[model samples]
Target: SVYDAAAQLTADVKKDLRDSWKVIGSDKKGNGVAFMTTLFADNQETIGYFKRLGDVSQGMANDKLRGHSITLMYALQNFIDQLDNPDDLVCVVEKFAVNHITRKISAAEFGKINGPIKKVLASKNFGDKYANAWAKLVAVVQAAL
Candidate 1:
């Protein structure tokens, strides 16, 4: 349904990231086309879950990049995967899930924040927001432990 459409539209996005990654590589914040590719590849379930929400057309990616549930969810999945300490991951995920429900960053700002990230994705400055978000998420994850 919508996912099929998101896939069609995003056909170029991955390629763009990949091509860029060959040149730039994963920056300090752990972002590069490869990072997105890895995240998307390993976290298919995460992106699929967000596909149910709405369109991911060009405008939608612009929107999704700025503020989408996928961002936080992807972040959560990554944090869980990266954590050496299970307790830390759990504490963070639990609190993050709760904070998401309470502050609604997952619902409200997911796409908003994604916007800037999407724009800067190929630039030298890519990953600030993503890294910041990742840091925040990891902090919660660390706390969980």
Candidate 2:
């Protein structure tokens, strides 16, 4: 099989993800900034969750959010890098799944990303062709939560 039984992104979606990674690969921070900025802008309430951002508004230039954005991109990069190698994918996912406990975040809260993430990707243009592929992939990724 092309995937682990735990999380099977179809070959098509997997390919789509890899290709999209290539396009965004050059600028993880750029993509991350766009993503986090859009996310915080749309959901201002989200800003309260982080520690350093209390003094910073979503619009301001700050290292705190940018650092987080890069972290987000790195996580995606890790996952995308593993798409073709199911064993490693499952390994990282297991670590991700376990480390974030009830205190880390709830499944319902995590579910919110489905909309915002897809919207960001769509606005980024790749989503025009890649949304379905991403949707399919995210569904499986979320299943573990």
Candidate 3:
């Protein structure tokens, strides 16, 4: 109750997030690739960021991109894993933020990707309740960025 009071995410919310994530993350490679696919398709300019990975033109067959796509999912999983601990959550968020900072990833760039990410979520039928929970988690990360 103490953590939930300050978490901005109740225990119930975290459970829903964890539950929905089980299915959303079940097809790690497939879901991640689909996300990357939709992200680049919607935000064409973002493709240059991954050029060294042997061209995303290869689409689903792009192995390097496939790995990266899964990495993105892992980051989200890590965030979910810290749902009950804001202190740990911010620690992980800061780590990710610093890593992205070195790569010159500004909050604006992060904002641009959210639209496509949401599109992929919608495709997965992520309901409003869980989607809002994920949004709250991301809002915290966004503020740190």
When summed lDDT is taken over every stretch of 10 residues in candidate 2, the lowest stretch is: 1-10
TM-score for each prediction?
0.29, 0.79, 0.85
Which of the numbered candidates is closest to the native, going by highest lDDT? 3
Cα distance off (Å), candidate 1, residue 138: 19
Off by over 4 Å in 2: 1-6, 55-60
lDDT by residue for model 3 over 11-106, one digit each (tens)?
887887898788888987888888788878888988877777788877768889888988989998898888777888877888878877787776
Query: For candidate 2, lDDT tens digit of each residue in 106-140?
Result: 55655555566677677667865676666665555
**Candidate no. 3 TM-score:** 0.85
Which lDDT value does model 3 have at 97?
80
Rank all candidate structures by their lDDT, best first, as comma-separated numbers.
3, 2, 1
Angstrom error at residue 60, model 1: 31
Worst 10 residues of 1 by lDDT: 1-10
The reply for model 3, stretches above 4 Å from the true place, is 1-6
